[PDB]
């Protein structure tokens, strides 16, 4: 169940669901595994908020263990296309693709809550079939791995060689270490 | 409009 | 869950779901596997937008790993029938049938986001039964393969011999290579 | 999910689902497998449109791999009963029963989209039990096969002997061949 | 999904589902297998239409392979109780219990569409337990078989001995043979 | 099913669900296992109530056997970020993560009903793979265990050494013992 | 399905579901097994009715085979906290936890319908693991058993030794015996 | 109308 | 606004 | 279980299983479905009996519904290679491959028991994959069908055109009709 | 069941199973799928026959659809190590690995029965995991593919380029075509 | 099935199974996955052959994808304990534990067949439970990893640092590379 | 499969299975999980060897992850009853009950192979039912835990307090540490 | 012997 809230306006009272209420204030939630359907919904929200106001920041709240890459790159490419600065915040955790969408936010507007945790690794995949087809799909996921490391280096500021060494295996980063690593910019410990 | 192709102010 | 948005009009406020809101601005989403039911829904949207305004472009956003061919050809034939120019955009990925609907868009109005990826191969199928029936279904899928290669050559500009060689096995194309291959026209890196 | 559309009228704005919107313009969709429940819904739509206006054509859009025969004959008998001319269009595919409902449309108002494909075969069935019961159900499905071939010959214009030879096994017909075979009348390549 | 239709009235426009729209015109659908819940719904519709107008005919459209007997006899006893004449029409098929509800309609107002098919047999049942309990349930279903044959003879006009011989095994009747057998009265080939 | 209630206002009557009604009075329910989706919903409620009024206390009613840690830390970090004092109440039980969110409430505003019961233990986890990966995930959950014990000590007032000894295995605390342990502040035996 | 009812008021007609209608008259239903989610719903209803009117009695109708204890103690502690007297009625049956919530009602306002039946036993539980953990969970459920027997003795008026002897195994009490046992106060045979 | 057969301006 | 980044009175 | 029999010899008594006893008298059983393992066993028996005596006839008793073709052609090619004349007898039934091994016996030494039944059809097969692979496996099974019809014509004496017409679908032959068809030579009604 | 045979010797009669009898005459059967256990058994037979007599030919009868490669290369390397010439014969079929062991036989002593069929393709495989591991297993199976094509070229006499083109997809060879292709040497049509 | 062989001796003929025959000549087979039961059988064979003759070499033929470590170390420790030199040979493949038992053979008496392949990686494992238990099992498998790398370095002659780098991920070694790596000593290409 | 060996005696040759051969030399294997049936077999072997010779040592080779306690105590009590000294050896691993039977061997005759590993923990168990039954089974497994720690202290020489601390959780001991801990006496690195 | 390493006449 999803609670319903009421917004007071000049015309009259208005009934909203809680997630649609926050969308009115330019807040998007990225929850759970990243798949084609949920990601296609986040794209629709970003495009809508750009049209409603292209000069006001969009906020993307991330609590996800990651998922499909191609579904996540649809979110990434949209964030870079649109004019508004997509601020990203990590709540709970932001793993493999969730961490890539976290660091892909606008520079200076990427945050981590004080006890959140970030995880980064290299792409996972697989194939079954002839050796000629295994070579094709093996070359492809390596190109994806190279592309994801270049973009990680671009946004984090690190070198491509450093990103390659750290993402060969799973690497957990606390919220302070994510700041030092360039993955996020600061921490929202308390409200001021 | 709202889409990619459509222009926004 | 699908968020609800509000549109301000002269008559009054109006509550929409996010997907129906974008349909009002002539935007259609092709998400997930291509099947008869989702495809029959996309046809209904294209026909409706033609009637509402036959001189304004329709936009078809594609993030799909492909699916049934006969379901996809219902979308293709509709796009060519209607007067409006169906612009296509690739988000995340556009595989076997999604790539065919991508390149089938209006010439000059086919796009790929900078990190999207396109995949093309030949039709998949199968049958179990008598040898006389196996010959019938084997001849049919070969005719389908020939028809899909001719239309790929028509829209991409390549030769039929080139399409046949490249689609014998899976072939991945990055967004720049798709432009060079005639599959799409340009890239929407940033908004200008 | 099904998008919602808005129709502008003199009284005021009106919210419709996309399938109900097209029903207002005398368009019916026959999608997926033919069963008793979906077919009983198509009958209800045809009867309703006859009552609303008995002199305006009804349009039945077909994208189906066929299904139960008795469910399909309820659609066929309704189409012949009602006064309006039921125009049929094939999108994607129209197989065994979908092809019978395609050719059963009003003469001169049966169409195929340029890349659609039609398939025709003889009835499928089966029974398990005593030999006396096997004889009963075997005689019945043969009577059904004879009845379906007579009606196919009536609407296609072919002879009963030709329909019997062609439907002994699966036979695929492209959209041009369906025109030459009398199964449909013309092709909607482009809008003029 | 079920389409929504609009009815124009003096007070204003009114939104209906298609099945509820036809109920307003005294039309009931009996679709699928006969069970306690769907049958209890048909009883509620018949009682409601009697109260709204007891002098106008009710129409029961049948497309069913039969089902539970006790669920069907609730429909039968209601049809005989209420004052309005329940006209019955067979669409697609009307098997074991559906055929009993077909012939149970008002005399002179029972119809079959030209390609529909009727099937009649004796009750099916079963039990597992002690021999004393097997005798009880075996005697009961024989009483049911005797009662169903008497009522079949009453409405069809045939003799009880003829109904017993024909229902010992499955017997299919085309729409013309159903007229000759007294099961229905005429055929709705075309509208006049 | 969820009952609907009516609120009397100056403008008119207003229909609410019972959970949305209590949200209007700044009451949130944390029920069942702690997962990403339910936790992302509680965050949305806390943020909304802060915006509506940042000086009025929020109430979080807890009846949960715990669940995922990363989902719970998103709730914890939100409670500490927002300006309003999040009062916590334990109903029925508050186990591993539910107990951590209970003690994380505002000091002086943490309560237990007289027969509720609290349980605390150390994190649960697991991994399957190479020894190099087992070392990574084993080091991580130990860091989580250390972080959860520090925060437990901060809010309960106990020492870090005491929290470590008591959470090595499951430890149940009645409502009086929770007060003596610093986990909660008082008991709501009766209303005064 | 849940029927909808209409309430006539001065402002106008009002549509309610049957369960929400009775909630307006301060009636709550405790049906089925006692779990965290249904119990958290009953708590929300009791708190709401206290706020609407703290001097009018609340009625809790019980037909339950019991369930989780911690979920039931959230209902019990709420009933004792709130100012209104929670009258309890047993319909059909009130077993292990349902019987505890039955006897926990306000003194003099606990009832049983004439053919209802009450069952009481000791807590059920279990654990699998090390012997050190088995000792912890075994000691805990014994403390719960002791607490549930003390509260049973408080409300029934019996001695703690009598409750212990009777709850060592399942004990069924008819509606007259429940009155003699102090579990309920009287019987609602007929309305006067 | 809206359909294939129906004409649009 | 309502979010983390947005300021509230 | 398999019974054991005793053979009296000059050296002494000898214990045999019943199937090994009959192998000593040059009798082989082909029972059940034709697979690689049972067929590789029949080949071993034929080769052994050739070596023991190359001038004495081998008897192959067939009661099989057929099976894999490649397993059966190993039996066929062995029968034609070895010098002894492999007499074949049909007991119960000899279907698709069992009928091919029946007619493949030595001319004049092929028999059917009076109530046995023979069935012949065309090969069954199937494949799932790319269209290029479907063409390969479809061409192959057609070559197998052509090869099996040529060998059927060689041994039965019929023409290749007659075998093609009769094997397009399942065709049952009684023991007299098998003699008239050239499939077997005579019938063992009684022993003389 | 496996029949037992008797061998007459000077010392006395001797009971053998049929497969062990043929092993005494230097005949080995390779039946069914190639796995580690059956292959380790064939190696034990070859080594034993070498020791018993190193100057007498060993015969390997092949009826197999192939299987694991590493299990088959244990058979291949043994055949090349031992001094006796391993003659190979194809019965029924010899597919991917069975064909490699067929052509690996001694030159001039490789045979096909007249209706046997040979199939050759490239290795099949697969992996699921990180991209770094996919590259490792993808490179390995390509090295295996290269090694299997070199050895196929060595024994067949064809060029490495010809073997690569023909094994990119499944290729069926009849017994005459296998002789022309160098895969086998001659055909055992009849015994002379 | 396992073939039976005959050994000629002075006392008389003797029937053996093929695996027991080779055991008489001091040959042991290590086939399939390494588990406790098969490994406990190999230990029994090694101990028996030591007692029969402690000065004659034992041969261990390896075709295994590895398995449990503790089962394999029982084989390793036995090989080092007994006085005879355990020669090892790789047939087909010798993966993770099979490679460790291969290199553990007597120095100078370790062989690989020309097309065999060796694979080495680090231990695999896993655990589910409390963090305190995860630390225990994580420390243990790291000690095992360290012990297995030391013994690999001892027998291969490489350095501990080289073994650690190469076994961090799967590493395949052909038969020539295994010789160069010190894993085996030479190759048995042909018999001389 | 289990290999067969031959023993040379004065009377004649004798065929044995490998496990029965070693039993003749007073060697018993304890392999796999400890259950009632395998343990009842080990008891039968120990009793038999005592009767054959009561002054010669019995050897029990252990490679087991433990299992049921009651099955293991039947082995322990037998080892202490019989006069011969039961020497124990650990191969691969000896976990919870296997370690108890290892240390229960005769003092001075308990060994570990150089790379074996020992694990000790407290008993595992569980129950589901009434609280009165949970108390009974919880008290019992605690008595078992106390009894197993006393016997561990008796044989290892450690104190009862030390055994209790070390067995609260899983504790792995290498072969050297087992010697230092009193669990075994020495190591069989090489044969001398 | 019989094995790989053992020599045969």
Numbering used by the authors:
A (entry chain G), C (entry chain A), D (entry chain B), E (entry chain C), F (entry chain F), G (entry chain E), ...: 2 to 193
B (entry chain O), H (entry chain P), I (entry chain U), N (entry chain Y): 267 to 275
Publication excerpt:
In the ClpXP protease, for example, AAA+ ClpX ring hexamers bind target proteins, unfold them, and translocate the unfolded polypeptide through an axial channel and into the peptidase chamber of ClpP, which consists of two heptameric rings (Wang et al., 1997; Grimaud et al., 1998; Ortega et al., 2000; Ortega et al., 2002; Sauer and Baker, 2011). ClpX subunits consist of a family specific N-terminal domain, which is dispensable for degradation of ssrA-tagged proteins, and large and small AAA+ domains, which contain sequence motifs that mediate ATP binding and hydrolysis, ClpP binding, and substrate recognition (Baker and Sauer, 2012). We describe here near atomic-resolution single-particle cryo-EM structures of single-chain ClpX pseudohexamers bound to ClpP and protein substrates.
As single-particle data processing with C2 symmetry produced maps with conformational heterogeneity, we used signal-subtraction methods to allow independent classification and refinement of ClpX∆N or ClpP density. We calculated a D7 symmetric map for ClpP and parts of ClpX∆N making symmetric contacts, four different classes of symmetry-free ClpX∆N maps, and then extended each asymmetric ClpX∆N map to include one heptameric ClpP ring. ClpP had essentially the same structure in the D7 and symmetry-free ClpXP maps. ClpX IGF loops, named for an Ile268-Gly269-Phe270 sequence, are critical for ClpP binding and were responsible for most contacts in our structures. These interactions included packing of the Ile268, Phe270, and Val274 side chains into pockets at interfaces between ClpP subunits. Asymmetric ClpX-ClpP docking relies on conformational adjustments in the N- and C-terminal residues of individual IGF loops, allowing the central portion of each IGF loop to contact the flat ClpP ring despite projecting from a spiral. In our structures, the side chain of Arg192 in ClpP appeared to hydrogen bond to the backbone of the IGF loop.
